[PDB]
Coordinates of N, CA and C and ligand atoms in Angstrom, one line a residue:
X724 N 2.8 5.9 -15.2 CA 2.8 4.5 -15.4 C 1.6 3.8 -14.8
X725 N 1.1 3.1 -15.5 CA -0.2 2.2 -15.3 C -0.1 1.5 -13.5
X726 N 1.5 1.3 -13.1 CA 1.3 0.7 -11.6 C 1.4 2.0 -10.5
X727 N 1.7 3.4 -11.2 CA 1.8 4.3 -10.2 C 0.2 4.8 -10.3
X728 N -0.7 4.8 -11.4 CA -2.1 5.0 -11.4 C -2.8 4.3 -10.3
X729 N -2.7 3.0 -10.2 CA -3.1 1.6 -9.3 C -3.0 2.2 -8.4
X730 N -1.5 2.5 -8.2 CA -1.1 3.0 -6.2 C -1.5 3.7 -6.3
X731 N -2.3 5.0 -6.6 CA -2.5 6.0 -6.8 C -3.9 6.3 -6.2
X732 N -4.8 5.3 -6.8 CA -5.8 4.7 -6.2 C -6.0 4.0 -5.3
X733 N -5.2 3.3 -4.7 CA -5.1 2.6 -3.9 C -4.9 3.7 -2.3
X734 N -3.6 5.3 -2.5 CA -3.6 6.1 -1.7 C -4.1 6.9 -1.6
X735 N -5.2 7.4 -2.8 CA -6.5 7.9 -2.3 C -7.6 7.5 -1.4
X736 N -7.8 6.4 -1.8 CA -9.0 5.5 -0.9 C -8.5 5.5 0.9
X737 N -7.1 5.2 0.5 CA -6.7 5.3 1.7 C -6.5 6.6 2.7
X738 N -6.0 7.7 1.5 CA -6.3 8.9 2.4 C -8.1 9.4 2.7
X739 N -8.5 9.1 1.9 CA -10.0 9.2 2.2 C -10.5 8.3 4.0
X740 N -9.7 6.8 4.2 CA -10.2 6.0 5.3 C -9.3 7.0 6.2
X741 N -8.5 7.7 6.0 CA -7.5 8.2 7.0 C -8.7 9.5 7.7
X742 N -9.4 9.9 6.8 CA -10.7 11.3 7.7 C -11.1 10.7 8.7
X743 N -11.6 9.5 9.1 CA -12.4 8.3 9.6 C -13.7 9.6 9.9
X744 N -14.5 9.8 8.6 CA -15.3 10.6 8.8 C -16.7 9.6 8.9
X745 N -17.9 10.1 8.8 CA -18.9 9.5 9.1 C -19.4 7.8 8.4
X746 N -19.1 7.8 7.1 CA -19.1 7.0 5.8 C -18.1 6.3 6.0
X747 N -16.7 6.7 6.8 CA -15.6 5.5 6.8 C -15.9 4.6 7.8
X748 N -16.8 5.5 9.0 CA -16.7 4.8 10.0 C -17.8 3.8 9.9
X749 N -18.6 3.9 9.2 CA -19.6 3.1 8.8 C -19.1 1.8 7.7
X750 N -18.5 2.3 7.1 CA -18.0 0.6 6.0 C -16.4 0.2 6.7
X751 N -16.2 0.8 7.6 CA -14.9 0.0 8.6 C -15.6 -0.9 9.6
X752 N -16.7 -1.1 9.6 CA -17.5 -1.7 10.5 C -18.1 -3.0 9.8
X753 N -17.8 -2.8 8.5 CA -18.7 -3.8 7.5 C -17.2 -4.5 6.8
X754 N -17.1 -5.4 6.4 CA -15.9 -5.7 5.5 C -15.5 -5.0 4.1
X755 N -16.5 -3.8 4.3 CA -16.2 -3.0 2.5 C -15.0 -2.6 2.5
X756 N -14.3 -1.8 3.6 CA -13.1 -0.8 3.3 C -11.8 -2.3 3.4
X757 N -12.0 -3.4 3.8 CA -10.5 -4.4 4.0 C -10.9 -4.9 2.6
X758 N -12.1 -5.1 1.9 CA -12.4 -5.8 0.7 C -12.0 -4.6 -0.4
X759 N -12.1 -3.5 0.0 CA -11.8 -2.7 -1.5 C -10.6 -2.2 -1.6
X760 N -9.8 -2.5 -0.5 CA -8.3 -2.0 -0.1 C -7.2 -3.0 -0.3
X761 N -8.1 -4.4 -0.6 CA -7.6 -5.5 -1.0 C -7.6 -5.7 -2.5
X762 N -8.5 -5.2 -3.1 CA -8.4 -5.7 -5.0 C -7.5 -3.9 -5.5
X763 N -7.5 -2.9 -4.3 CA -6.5 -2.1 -4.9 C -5.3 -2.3 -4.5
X764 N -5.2 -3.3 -4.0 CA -3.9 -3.8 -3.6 C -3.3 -4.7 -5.1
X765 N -3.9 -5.9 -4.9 CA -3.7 -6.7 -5.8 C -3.7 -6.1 -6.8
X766 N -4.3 -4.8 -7.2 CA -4.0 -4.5 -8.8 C -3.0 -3.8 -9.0
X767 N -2.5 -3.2 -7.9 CA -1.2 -2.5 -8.1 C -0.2 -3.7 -7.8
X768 N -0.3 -5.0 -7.1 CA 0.8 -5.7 -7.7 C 1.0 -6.4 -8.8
X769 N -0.1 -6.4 -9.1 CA -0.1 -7.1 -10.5 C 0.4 -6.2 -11.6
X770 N 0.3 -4.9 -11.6 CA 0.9 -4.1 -12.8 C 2.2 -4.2 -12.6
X771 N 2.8 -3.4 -11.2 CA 4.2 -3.8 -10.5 C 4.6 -5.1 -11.3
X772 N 4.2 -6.4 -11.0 CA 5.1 -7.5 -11.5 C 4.6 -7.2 -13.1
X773 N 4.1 -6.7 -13.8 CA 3.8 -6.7 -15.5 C 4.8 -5.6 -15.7
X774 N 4.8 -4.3 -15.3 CA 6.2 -3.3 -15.4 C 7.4 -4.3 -15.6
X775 N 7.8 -4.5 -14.4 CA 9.1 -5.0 -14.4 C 9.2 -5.9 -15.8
X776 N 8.6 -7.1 -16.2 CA 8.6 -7.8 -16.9 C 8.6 -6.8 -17.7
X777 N 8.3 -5.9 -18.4 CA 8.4 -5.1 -19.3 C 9.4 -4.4 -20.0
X778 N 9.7 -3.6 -19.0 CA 11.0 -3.2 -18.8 C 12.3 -4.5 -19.2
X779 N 11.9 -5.6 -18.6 CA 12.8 -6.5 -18.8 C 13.7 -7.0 -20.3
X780 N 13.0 -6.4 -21.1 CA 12.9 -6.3 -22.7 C 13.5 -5.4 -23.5
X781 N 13.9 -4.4 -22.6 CA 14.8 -3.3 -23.0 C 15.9 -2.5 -21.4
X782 N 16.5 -3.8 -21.5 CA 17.8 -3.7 -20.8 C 19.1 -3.3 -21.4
X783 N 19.9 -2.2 -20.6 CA 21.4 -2.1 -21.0 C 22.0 -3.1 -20.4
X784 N 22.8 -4.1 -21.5 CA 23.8 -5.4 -20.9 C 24.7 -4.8 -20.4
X785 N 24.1 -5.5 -19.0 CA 25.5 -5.6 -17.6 C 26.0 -6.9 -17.3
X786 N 27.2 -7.1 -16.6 CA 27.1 -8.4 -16.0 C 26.0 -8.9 -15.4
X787 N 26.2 -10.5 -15.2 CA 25.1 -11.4 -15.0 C 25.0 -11.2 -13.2
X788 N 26.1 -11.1 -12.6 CA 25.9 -10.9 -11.3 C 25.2 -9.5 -11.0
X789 N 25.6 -8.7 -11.7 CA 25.1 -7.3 -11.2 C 23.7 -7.3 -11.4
X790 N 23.0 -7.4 -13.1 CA 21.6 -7.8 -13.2 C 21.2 -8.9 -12.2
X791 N 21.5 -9.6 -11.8 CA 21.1 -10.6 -10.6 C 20.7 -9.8 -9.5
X792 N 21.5 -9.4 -9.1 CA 21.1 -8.4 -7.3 C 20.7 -7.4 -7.8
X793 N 20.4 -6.6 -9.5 CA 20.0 -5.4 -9.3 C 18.1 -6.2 -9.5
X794 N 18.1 -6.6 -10.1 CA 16.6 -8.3 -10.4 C 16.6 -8.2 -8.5
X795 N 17.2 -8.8 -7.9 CA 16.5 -9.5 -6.6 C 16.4 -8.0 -5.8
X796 N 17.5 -7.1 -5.5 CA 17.1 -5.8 -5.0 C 15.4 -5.1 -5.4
X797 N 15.3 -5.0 -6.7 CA 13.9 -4.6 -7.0 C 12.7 -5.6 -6.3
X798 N 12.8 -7.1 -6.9 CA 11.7 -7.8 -5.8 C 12.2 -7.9 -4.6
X799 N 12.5 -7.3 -3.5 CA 12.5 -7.4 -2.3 C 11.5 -5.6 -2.1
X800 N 12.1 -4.6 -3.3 CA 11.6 -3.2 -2.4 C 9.6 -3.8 -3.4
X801 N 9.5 -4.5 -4.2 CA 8.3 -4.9 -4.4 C 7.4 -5.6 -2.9
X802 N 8.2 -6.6 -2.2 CA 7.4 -7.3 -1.1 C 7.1 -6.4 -0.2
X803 N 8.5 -5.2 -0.3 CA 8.0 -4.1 1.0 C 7.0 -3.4 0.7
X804 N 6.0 -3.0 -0.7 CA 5.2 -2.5 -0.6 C 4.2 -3.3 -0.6
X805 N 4.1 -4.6 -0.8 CA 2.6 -5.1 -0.8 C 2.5 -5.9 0.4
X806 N 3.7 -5.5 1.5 CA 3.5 -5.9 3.0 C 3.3 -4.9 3.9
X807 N 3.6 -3.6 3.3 CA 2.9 -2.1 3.7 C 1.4 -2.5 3.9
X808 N 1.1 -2.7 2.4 CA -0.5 -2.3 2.0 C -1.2 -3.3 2.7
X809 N -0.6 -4.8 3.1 CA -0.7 -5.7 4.4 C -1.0 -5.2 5.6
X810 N -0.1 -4.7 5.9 CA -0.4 -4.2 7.3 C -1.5 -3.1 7.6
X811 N -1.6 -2.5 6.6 CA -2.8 -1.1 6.6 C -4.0 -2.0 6.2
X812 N -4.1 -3.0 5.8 CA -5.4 -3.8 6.1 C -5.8 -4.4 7.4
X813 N -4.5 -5.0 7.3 CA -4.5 -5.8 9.3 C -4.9 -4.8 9.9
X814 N -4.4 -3.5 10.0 CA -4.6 -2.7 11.2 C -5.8 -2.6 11.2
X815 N -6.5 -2.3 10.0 CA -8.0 -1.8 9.7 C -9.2 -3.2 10.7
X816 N -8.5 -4.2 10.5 CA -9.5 -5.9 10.5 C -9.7 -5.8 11.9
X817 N -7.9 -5.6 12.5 CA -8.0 -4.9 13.9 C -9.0 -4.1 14.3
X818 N -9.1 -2.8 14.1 CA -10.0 -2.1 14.8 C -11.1 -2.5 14.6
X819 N -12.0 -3.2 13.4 CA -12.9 -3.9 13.7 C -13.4 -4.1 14.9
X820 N -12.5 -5.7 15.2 CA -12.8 -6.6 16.2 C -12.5 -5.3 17.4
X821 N -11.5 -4.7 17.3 CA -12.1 -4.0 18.9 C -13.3 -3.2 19.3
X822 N -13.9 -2.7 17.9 CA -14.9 -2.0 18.3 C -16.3 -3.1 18.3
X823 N -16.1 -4.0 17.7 CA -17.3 -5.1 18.2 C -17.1 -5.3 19.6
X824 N -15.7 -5.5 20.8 CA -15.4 -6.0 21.9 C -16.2 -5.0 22.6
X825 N -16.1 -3.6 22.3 CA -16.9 -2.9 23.2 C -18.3 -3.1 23.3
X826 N -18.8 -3.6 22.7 CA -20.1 -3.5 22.8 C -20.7 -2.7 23.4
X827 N -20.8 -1.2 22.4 CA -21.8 -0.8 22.3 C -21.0 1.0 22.6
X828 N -19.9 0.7 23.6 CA -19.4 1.8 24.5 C -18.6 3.1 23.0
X829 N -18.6 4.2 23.9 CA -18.0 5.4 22.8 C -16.8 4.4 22.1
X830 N -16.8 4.8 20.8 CA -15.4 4.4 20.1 C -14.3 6.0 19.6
X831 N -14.7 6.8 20.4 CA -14.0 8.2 20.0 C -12.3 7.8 20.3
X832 N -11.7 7.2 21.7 CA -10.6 6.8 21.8 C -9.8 5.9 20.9
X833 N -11.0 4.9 20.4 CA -10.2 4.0 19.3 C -9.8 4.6 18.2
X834 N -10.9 5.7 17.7 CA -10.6 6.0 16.6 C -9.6 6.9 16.6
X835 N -9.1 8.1 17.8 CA -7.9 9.2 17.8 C -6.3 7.6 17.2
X836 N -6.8 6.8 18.3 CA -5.3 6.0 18.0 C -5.2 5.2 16.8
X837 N -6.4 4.9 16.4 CA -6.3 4.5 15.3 C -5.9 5.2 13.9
X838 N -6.0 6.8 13.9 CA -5.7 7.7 13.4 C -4.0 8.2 13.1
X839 N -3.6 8.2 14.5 CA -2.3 8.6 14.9 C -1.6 7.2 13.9
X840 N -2.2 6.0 14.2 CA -1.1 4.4 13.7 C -1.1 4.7 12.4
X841 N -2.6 4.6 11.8 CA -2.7 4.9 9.7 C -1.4 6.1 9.7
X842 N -1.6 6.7 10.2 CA -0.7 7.8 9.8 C 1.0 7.5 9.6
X843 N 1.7 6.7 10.8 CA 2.7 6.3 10.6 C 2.8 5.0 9.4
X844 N 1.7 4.4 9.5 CA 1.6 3.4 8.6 C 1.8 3.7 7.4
X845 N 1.0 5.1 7.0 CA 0.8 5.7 5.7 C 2.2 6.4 5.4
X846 N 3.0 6.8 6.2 CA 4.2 7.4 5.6 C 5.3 6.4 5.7
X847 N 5.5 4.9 6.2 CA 6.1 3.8 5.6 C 5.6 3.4 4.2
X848 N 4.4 3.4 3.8 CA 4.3 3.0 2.4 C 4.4 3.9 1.5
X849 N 4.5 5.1 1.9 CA 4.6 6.5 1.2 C 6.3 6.4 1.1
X850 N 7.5 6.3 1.9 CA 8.5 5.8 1.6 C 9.4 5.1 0.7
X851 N 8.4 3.6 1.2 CA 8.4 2.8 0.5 C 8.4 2.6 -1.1
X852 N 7.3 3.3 -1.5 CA 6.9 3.6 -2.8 C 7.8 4.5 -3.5
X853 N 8.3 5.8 -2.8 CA 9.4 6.3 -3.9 C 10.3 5.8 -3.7
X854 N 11.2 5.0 -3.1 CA 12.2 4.0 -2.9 C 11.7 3.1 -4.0
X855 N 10.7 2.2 -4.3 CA 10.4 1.4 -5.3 C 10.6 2.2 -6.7
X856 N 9.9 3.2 -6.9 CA 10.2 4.0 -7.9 C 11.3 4.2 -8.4
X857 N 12.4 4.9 -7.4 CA 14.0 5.2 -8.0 C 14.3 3.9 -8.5
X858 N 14.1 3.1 -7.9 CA 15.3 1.7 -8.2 C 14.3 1.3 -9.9
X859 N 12.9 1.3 -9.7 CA 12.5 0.6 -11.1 C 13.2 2.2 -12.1
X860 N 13.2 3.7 -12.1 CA 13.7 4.5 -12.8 C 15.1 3.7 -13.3
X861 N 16.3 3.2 -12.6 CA 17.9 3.3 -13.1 C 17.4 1.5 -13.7
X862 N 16.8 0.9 -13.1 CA 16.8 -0.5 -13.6 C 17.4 -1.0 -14.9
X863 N 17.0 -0.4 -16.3 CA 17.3 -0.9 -17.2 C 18.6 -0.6 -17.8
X864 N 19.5 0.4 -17.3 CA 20.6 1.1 -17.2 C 21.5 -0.3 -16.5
Ligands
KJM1359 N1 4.8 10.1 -7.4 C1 5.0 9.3 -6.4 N2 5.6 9.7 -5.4 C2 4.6 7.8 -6.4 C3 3.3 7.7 -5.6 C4 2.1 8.1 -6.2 C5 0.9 7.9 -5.5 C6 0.9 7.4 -4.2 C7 2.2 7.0 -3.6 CL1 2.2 6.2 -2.1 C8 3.3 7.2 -4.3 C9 4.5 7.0 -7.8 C10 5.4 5.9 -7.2 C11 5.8 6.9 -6.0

């Protein structure tokens, strides 16, 4: 699907910032990696909300209450992924500013913890996403 392509890209880039190899550590220091982690954000919600709408067009008629919460169930597991991909920016904006605060001093410590956090961060939106997935699969049922 054109929005699992998007995330797709969006969790390579990301596993790529997760090496914090020489090149990451260099544009985590510049606004490149919050700026490009941002329009792969935005583009996977914008297919997400164009899917749905899609799908919306070839529905099995259910009751109106059930289509209602099975509608509001799907946009709620939609905010939990583009408040995932939120927070894996925040965190990133974060370490920034701490590694400006040292001025100047080793950043080897910030980067182990910083490591260890993406990593739990990364398996909530990794979660998250096939939980979005099942529910948009039965949706039109
Ligand atoms: N095949 C998957 N598990 C999906 C996926 C793909 C790439 C990255 C991520 Cl996080 C999730 C597609 C929607 C769930």
């Amino acid at each position: 699907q054109r929005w699992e392509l998007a995330l797709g890209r969006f969790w390579d880039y990301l596993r790529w910032v997760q090496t914090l190899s020489e090149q990451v550590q260099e544009e985590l220091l510049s606004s490149q990696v919050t700026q490009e982690l941002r329009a792969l954000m935005d583009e996977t919600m914008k297919e997400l909300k164009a899917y749905k709408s899609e799908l919306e067009e070839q529905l099995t008629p259910v009751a109106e209450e059930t289509r209602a919460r099975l509608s509001k169930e799907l946009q709620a597991a939609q905010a939990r992924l583009g408040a995932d991909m939120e927070d894996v920016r925040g965190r990133l904006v974060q370490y920034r500013g701490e590694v400006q605060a040292m001025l100047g001093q080793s950043t080897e410590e910030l980067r182990v913890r910083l490591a260890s956090h993406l990593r739990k961060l990364r398996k909530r939106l990794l979660r998250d996403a096939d939980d979005l997935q099942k529910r948009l699969a039965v949706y039109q049922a």
